[PDB]
Amino acid sequence: IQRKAIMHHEGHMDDGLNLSRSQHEESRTARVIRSTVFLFNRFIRGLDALSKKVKLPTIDLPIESVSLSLQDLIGYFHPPDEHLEHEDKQNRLRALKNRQNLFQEEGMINLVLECIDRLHVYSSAAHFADVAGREAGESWKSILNSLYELLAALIRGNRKNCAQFSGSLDWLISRLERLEASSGILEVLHCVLVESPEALNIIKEGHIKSIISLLDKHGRNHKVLDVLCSLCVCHGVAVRSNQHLICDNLLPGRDLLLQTRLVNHVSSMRPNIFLGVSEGSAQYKKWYYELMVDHTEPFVTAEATHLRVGWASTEGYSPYPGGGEEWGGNGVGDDLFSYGFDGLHLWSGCIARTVSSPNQHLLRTDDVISCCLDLSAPSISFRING
Amino acid sequence: DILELTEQEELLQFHYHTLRLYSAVCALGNHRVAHALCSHVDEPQLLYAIENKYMPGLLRAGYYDLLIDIHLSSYATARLMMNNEFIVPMTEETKSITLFPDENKKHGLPGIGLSTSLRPRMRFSSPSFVSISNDCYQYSPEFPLDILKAKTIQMLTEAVKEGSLHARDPVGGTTEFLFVPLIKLFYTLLIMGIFHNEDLKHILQLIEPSGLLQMKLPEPVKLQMCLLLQYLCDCQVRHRIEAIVAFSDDFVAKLQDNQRFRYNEVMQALNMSAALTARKTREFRSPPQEQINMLLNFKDDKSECPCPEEIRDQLLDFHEDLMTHCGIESLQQLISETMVRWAQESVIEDPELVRAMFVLLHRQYDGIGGLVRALPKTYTINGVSVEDTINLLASLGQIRSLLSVRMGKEEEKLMIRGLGDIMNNKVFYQHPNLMRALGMHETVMEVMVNVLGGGESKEITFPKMVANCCRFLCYFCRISRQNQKAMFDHLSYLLENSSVGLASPAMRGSTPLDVAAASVMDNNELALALREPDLEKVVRYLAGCGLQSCQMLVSKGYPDIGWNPVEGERYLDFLRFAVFCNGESVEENANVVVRLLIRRPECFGPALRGEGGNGLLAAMEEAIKIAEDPSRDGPDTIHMGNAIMTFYAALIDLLGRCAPEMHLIHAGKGEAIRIRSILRSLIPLGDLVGVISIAFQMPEPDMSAGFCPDHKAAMVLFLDRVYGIEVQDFLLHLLEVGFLPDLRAAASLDTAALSX
Amino acid sequence: LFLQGYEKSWIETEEHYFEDKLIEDLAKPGARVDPLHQLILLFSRTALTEKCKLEEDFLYMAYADIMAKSCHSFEEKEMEKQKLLYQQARLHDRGAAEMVLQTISASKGETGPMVAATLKLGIAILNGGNSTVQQKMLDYLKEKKDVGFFQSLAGLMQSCSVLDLNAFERQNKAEGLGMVTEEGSGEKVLQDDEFTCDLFRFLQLLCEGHNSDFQNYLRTQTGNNTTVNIIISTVDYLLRVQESISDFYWYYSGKDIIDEQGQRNFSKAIQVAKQVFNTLTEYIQGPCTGNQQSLAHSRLWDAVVGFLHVFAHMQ
Amino acid sequence: GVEIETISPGDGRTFPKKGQTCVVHYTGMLQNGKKFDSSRDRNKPFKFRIGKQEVIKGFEEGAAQMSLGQRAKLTCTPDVAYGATGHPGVIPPNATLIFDVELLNLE
């Protein structure tokens, strides 16, 4: 329905032009929209003329002005303080929702997306410096960060905005791997997934794979995990497909994230004996002792009973022998400063090597072991039951 | 060491967030991922983390929530869903709690006694991955519930002992991290059907002694305390209802033989008079509902009271016991004291906590409101159908969980299976009252609106789910007399999206329009209560289908006729079911339907009404020739000629059934004459007799998707209900033109009979 | 069936009296902010939380009923009036008038149980010529210049309930032959007369005392962008109910017999019309030339002519 | 593909036979020592039938070569345990499993 108004001579007696005062809040918001769209169209024209081909530097590229305008718009869309009066906070929330609706209904989000694309066509700040200049290459990072913050603030509280522009999630997640605006892109994705349930219906397996690869590349960041939580559950409802995709593609190999185990406390005992070799005064470089066991359960509570015996070195001629720090699962043979034997394997550097022996078995009860050690040419040795 | 994360802020936060992710990836009833996460963390590491005193607190809460979500949340949510439904059997264990100890100076402890109520069976599959192709892995991962019970009991004792002295380092950090996860675990454990009387006494020995409600606890702790107390009152209300049913069994057992004895005594000492047949009609009529309604009213000096005054004293004793057991004139008193004290201590944030506290206080002060709200939902069944009712409740809980989770292919398949189960459960036939008490139609309607949401006419996502829902609703309304009235409220909604499912002769049953027609079908009271906020919508839909081409047949290859006869047929079927019920024409409904159809002329066929086609004769001859030439169809298929024919037959049938009457009221009423004159001006008589005279071929079998005698049957019905046969000339005329050829064709039959 | 009957007519027959003691021991400052004041603030924050539809809020529906039932030969009359004033003070010094106004304004003019309970609370808080609560409400409406309250009142007055004859005829046709239910719930002919009379009694109590300021604020909301005439809305509803009564008399004109359904519908119509007339009297009482001219320049004369006709013929 | 390494001899007299519900106690782990499954955690054994196509081949064919009270290390390969698809969520594609198979009872 579009009844185009035409100014004719006679007129008809049915116009009835009633007036509405256009509240000062809405008027200020609209004039701000006009100023911002003008400045952004100016910046877009300048960047397009600069990128399409080399041109004269006598173009309008208000880097400083657009930075200041973004800094002002972020504060304009800043959420109200939580430590405030309830009534005033609700009024500020309503005003922010009105501003967001006005900015959405005038084609501003697509404008910000166009600016973001024309800023991301360049690779790095050094790559932007030789094309735009020193100051523009210096503050291109700041401009991109401010633009992403503004895009997030425009959609932080509102729901219609997210349900409307949700079709740009493909472009968002594709640009997510720019290595430079990852924080802003992740924040925008989180605030668009936490509110709009329409967004979860277009998140396919490729997007989840890309987010998990982002987690694998950029490191351990809890924002990725929050985005995954929002993908699994949006509003009191679960998405079985997304949950299965997360469970299959996030922890199949257990290297994406931290692992955890329940291990035992092992203890290292020794007699007051020290064996060192040097030139001149030596100790015959040959030693030996024996072992018996009275009682040994195979599994005390939940895991295999750690029981090894061997020889441990030190830091030259000092106490405090090998081991990581203390109290861990590091017995003997679990490092390069120790050499142990458990009955079936040989431990040297937390790497067990299997050996062959008549009736090979662990150090069960009624097992007599004999430990011998020659120092210069050969090394330690074990004899099970003779 | 995991305890070293107390100082490292990065690994602490990252592990807290990955515990939250483990929780969120299997929060709802998703067990295929819980069966993986169990081993991905451990079986007993959860115990060790809830057991260790030295914890950062974030990891403690995370491990607590993870244990809850992967081992207990499924059955906890199942019980929370099927917790307000008080389904009772009729076994002798029910009649054992007829005392409900309240007299002789005792009130009892909440949760102590006998349950003997229908509850969902709990079971947890054993997590094993060496077993390839597990059976279902659908219930839950298995956990040592008894060990967890003992551990949480001793830890709650230790925690309250530590909090009584106000230490400077509670477990996990703040008193929040100390209490909230522990009391949440205890709450979900008490919910999930453990803490039998032995352990429940010991639990009450730390909150009851007059404790935990006397300490200065923060807001997140007292919120869980309010939830725990709300459950402690819910189980008390359940015990009250169980005792009510236990007493009611024997009371009605006595009353039934009492009234039967008084009836037999009247039979013997009849002593004919005038009031005797009145008493007879009172006993025969007045169904059991109003019979009980009349025999239960004695609170004033004198009213309608039957002869058995001896049971009235027992009823008064039971009611007085009930009122003294309720809040009117110690658990309710102490809960009230704690709530008022918490409210008076300081201004309370957390409006959720404030609301929980206030609703708990209100229900404690009211007492009876829980009864008047829960007695409409309670229901006793039998002692023989217990497993069948358990299967029904399990399938209903599955349907509710599927409603909670989002809709997909597997979810749609499981919902269809659950609907089939509750339809073949064999208790749906016997007890529809229990079905309304549980609200199965409510959940099915919610599922249907969730499926229909998203698209109006572009595309209906997840097809056949709305079909199964509509079929279940149709059958639910069919086997009943009051389920139709209960569903009539949703008719005003489903008529707006009734356009879906039409234009497809593959589902003559399941459809929103068809479930509407089934709800109004065979119910005079509903046909009368059906006013016109939606009849106008129906005629608007009929006008749209008669004007447009439905944009569905041009995609299949049909010749794009200037009107749709497949949706008009269904609309006229619904209008007929709404206007003609039990064999008589609803007067005002017929009147308003005629008004709408005459104000909107495009509802009729273009070849019958309008400045184009001549009338019904030419219209149906054109329809027959379209049926005969295959060049005007879609290359199971929709025969366009047959569709036009059944559309016109349905319109004629609707007009004949919306005719004023067969003249009982028309002999004296003027608007009846006006409606009959309007119908006669619409459909002439020569057209009717010419349409009757077609002499359909009677065959080597043939196809029944062409010109069937149902069309001429509807024509005869219209002629009888509008014009009628009263003069010898027209009677013999009609008999000669239309009736003799059809009767001869029906008589020409020896063995090959394919068209009944 | 026995259990259903027991639930229906054995338990909810006024078997408790706890509203007064509950309000008392909730308003007692045991020691800040009283618990009743905290509850009122919670309800006010819930009503001020801007949404698209007023929620059910069983909490509010159960507590407004209690706070309304808590309230209610010269010495005893003065003493009971003073006790009523004391109870109204106890439960409105904590901001219950603002709560009622906010809950009415947060309904967008749509009839519901929340609005019914809130109007019952407003009646119980404005019983008699309580001028303190009226002044509080007027100061609140003036310091928060909102038209939502007035348009909600207008929508409620426009779509509360009106007698219809088609539904009565359908009910008669149903009860003529259908004995399956007897149609014991005589509804659909006058939807919620309780809510209608409650709304008009709330307006009557708003204009109970000769408050010229409030009587002019209910006519021309000076200071707001758009104004709605509550007086004109009331006279329009009076005309509507007069036409409905006239039609119902035309139906029951000739048989000279009134069944019990007919008598009950007559009584409900008479009660609603009497409440409307009392509201109009409280609007125009005193030298309020504004409201006097508003009623004189409206369709009130046709309404009173039809009322005189129906009065003569029915008597 | 399936192999066995004796950890503790179990007298080598009674062996599992076809058509029995054998009682085992196992703790599994991946190739890199990361534990993925066990039976000593939930404190209950694992009862499984031999030759009924319910337990993976790398486990059943290795348990069919043990004796009562015997402990063994069973090492498997992907083609005998889970294949190129693995177990969705738990086992990565082409992962070799290692089990501490301890034989408790023979039924």
CSV table of C-alpha atoms in Angstrom, one decimal, chain A residues 191-332:
chain,number,residue,atom,x,y,z
A,191,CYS,CA,25.4,-11.9,21.9
A,192,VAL,CA,23.5,-13.0,18.7
A,193,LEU,CA,23.3,-16.6,19.8
A,194,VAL,CA,22.3,-15.9,23.4
A,195,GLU,CA,19.1,-14.0,22.4
A,196,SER,CA,17.9,-15.1,19.0
A,197,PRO,CA,16.7,-18.8,18.7
A,198,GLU,CA,16.4,-18.2,14.9
A,199,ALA,CA,20.2,-18.1,14.8
A,200,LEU,CA,20.7,-21.6,16.1
A,201,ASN,CA,18.7,-23.1,13.3
A,202,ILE,CA,21.2,-21.9,10.6
A,203,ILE,CA,24.3,-23.0,12.5
A,204,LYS,CA,25.5,-26.0,10.6
A,205,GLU,CA,28.3,-28.5,11.2
A,206,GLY,CA,30.8,-26.4,9.3
A,207,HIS,CA,30.3,-23.5,11.6
A,208,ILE,CA,30.9,-25.6,14.7
A,209,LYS,CA,33.9,-27.2,13.1
A,210,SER,CA,35.3,-23.7,12.4
A,211,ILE,CA,34.7,-22.5,16.0
A,212,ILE,CA,36.4,-25.6,17.4
A,213,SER,CA,39.4,-25.0,15.0
A,214,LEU,CA,39.4,-21.4,16.4
A,215,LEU,CA,39.6,-22.9,19.9
A,216,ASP,CA,42.4,-25.2,18.7
A,217,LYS,CA,44.4,-22.3,17.0
A,218,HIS,CA,44.0,-19.2,19.2
A,219,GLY,CA,44.4,-21.2,22.5
A,220,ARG,CA,42.4,-21.6,25.7
A,221,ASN,CA,39.7,-18.9,25.8
A,222,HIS,CA,36.5,-19.2,27.9
A,223,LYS,CA,34.6,-17.1,25.4
A,224,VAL,CA,34.7,-20.0,22.9
A,225,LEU,CA,33.3,-22.3,25.5
A,226,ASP,CA,30.5,-19.8,26.4
A,227,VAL,CA,29.6,-19.6,22.7
A,228,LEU,CA,29.5,-23.4,22.6
A,229,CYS,CA,27.3,-23.5,25.7
A,230,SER,CA,24.9,-21.0,24.0
A,231,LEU,CA,24.9,-23.2,20.9
A,232,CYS,CA,24.0,-26.3,23.0
A,233,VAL,CA,21.3,-24.5,24.9
A,234,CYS,CA,19.7,-21.2,23.8
A,235,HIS,CA,16.6,-20.6,25.9
A,236,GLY,CA,15.6,-23.4,28.3
A,237,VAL,CA,15.6,-25.8,25.3
A,238,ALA,CA,18.3,-28.2,24.0
A,239,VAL,CA,19.5,-28.7,20.5
A,240,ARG,CA,20.3,-32.4,20.2
A,241,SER,CA,22.1,-32.0,16.8
A,242,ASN,CA,24.4,-29.2,18.1
A,243,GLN,CA,25.1,-31.2,21.3
A,244,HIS,CA,26.0,-34.3,19.4
A,245,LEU,CA,28.2,-32.2,17.0
A,246,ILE,CA,30.0,-30.7,20.0
A,247,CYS,CA,30.5,-34.0,21.7
A,248,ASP,CA,31.9,-35.6,18.5
A,249,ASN,CA,34.1,-32.7,17.3
A,250,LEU,CA,35.3,-31.1,20.6
A,251,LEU,CA,36.6,-34.1,22.6
A,252,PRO,CA,37.4,-37.0,20.3
A,253,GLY,CA,41.1,-37.0,20.8
A,254,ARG,CA,41.2,-35.2,24.2
A,255,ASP,CA,43.8,-32.7,23.0
A,256,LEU,CA,41.6,-29.7,22.5
A,257,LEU,CA,41.2,-29.1,26.2
A,258,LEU,CA,42.5,-30.1,29.6
A,259,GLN,CA,42.2,-33.7,30.7
A,260,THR,CA,42.0,-35.1,34.3
A,261,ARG,CA,42.7,-38.3,36.1
A,262,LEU,CA,42.5,-39.7,39.7
A,263,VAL,CA,46.0,-41.0,40.4
A,264,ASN,CA,47.6,-42.4,43.6
A,265,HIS,CA,50.2,-40.9,45.9
A,266,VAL,CA,53.6,-42.8,45.6
A,267,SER,CA,56.5,-42.7,48.0
A,268,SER,CA,60.2,-43.0,47.5
A,269,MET,CA,62.3,-44.5,50.3
A,270,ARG,CA,66.0,-45.2,50.5
A,271,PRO,CA,68.8,-46.0,52.9
A,272,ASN,CA,71.6,-43.6,53.9
A,273,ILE,CA,73.8,-44.8,51.0
A,274,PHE,CA,75.6,-42.7,48.4
A,275,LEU,CA,77.5,-44.2,45.4
A,276,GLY,CA,79.8,-41.9,43.5
A,277,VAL,CA,82.7,-42.4,41.2
A,278,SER,CA,85.7,-40.2,40.4
A,279,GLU,CA,89.4,-40.4,39.6
A,280,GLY,CA,91.6,-41.8,42.4
A,281,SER,CA,89.5,-42.5,45.4
A,282,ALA,CA,86.7,-44.8,44.4
A,283,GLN,CA,84.3,-47.2,46.1
A,284,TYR,CA,85.1,-50.4,44.0
A,285,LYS,CA,82.1,-49.4,41.8
A,286,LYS,CA,80.2,-52.6,42.5
A,287,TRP,CA,77.2,-53.0,44.8
A,288,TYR,CA,74.2,-55.3,45.3
A,289,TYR,CA,71.3,-56.0,47.6
A,290,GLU,CA,68.1,-58.1,47.8
A,291,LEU,CA,64.3,-57.8,48.0
A,292,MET,CA,61.4,-59.7,49.5
A,293,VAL,CA,57.7,-58.8,49.8
A,294,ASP,CA,55.3,-59.8,52.5
A,295,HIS,CA,51.9,-58.6,51.3
A,296,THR,CA,50.9,-56.7,48.1
A,297,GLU,CA,47.4,-56.2,46.8
A,298,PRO,CA,47.1,-55.9,43.0
A,299,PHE,CA,44.5,-53.1,43.2
A,300,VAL,CA,44.1,-51.4,46.5
A,301,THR,CA,41.2,-49.0,45.7
A,302,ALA,CA,40.8,-48.2,42.0
A,303,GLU,CA,44.1,-48.4,40.0
A,304,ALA,CA,47.1,-50.6,39.7
A,305,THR,CA,49.4,-50.8,42.7
A,306,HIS,CA,52.5,-48.8,41.8
A,307,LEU,CA,55.6,-50.7,43.0
A,308,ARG,CA,59.0,-50.2,41.5
A,309,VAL,CA,62.6,-50.6,42.7
A,310,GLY,CA,65.8,-49.4,41.3
A,311,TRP,CA,68.6,-46.8,41.4
A,312,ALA,CA,68.2,-43.0,41.4
A,313,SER,CA,70.9,-40.4,40.5
A,314,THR,CA,71.3,-36.9,41.9
A,315,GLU,CA,72.4,-33.4,40.9
A,316,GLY,CA,76.2,-34.2,40.9
A,317,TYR,CA,77.2,-34.5,44.5
A,318,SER,CA,74.1,-33.1,46.2
A,319,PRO,CA,70.8,-34.3,47.8
A,320,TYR,CA,67.4,-33.7,46.2
A,321,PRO,CA,67.4,-36.5,43.5
A,322,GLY,CA,65.4,-36.7,40.3
A,323,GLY,CA,61.7,-36.1,40.1
A,324,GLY,CA,59.4,-33.3,38.9
A,325,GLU,CA,58.8,-31.6,42.3
A,326,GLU,CA,57.1,-34.1,44.7
A,327,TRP,CA,54.0,-36.1,45.6
A,328,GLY,CA,53.1,-36.8,41.9
A,329,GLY,CA,52.8,-40.0,40.1
A,330,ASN,CA,56.6,-39.9,39.6
A,331,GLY,CA,58.3,-42.9,41.3
A,332,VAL,CA,61.5,-44.3,40.1
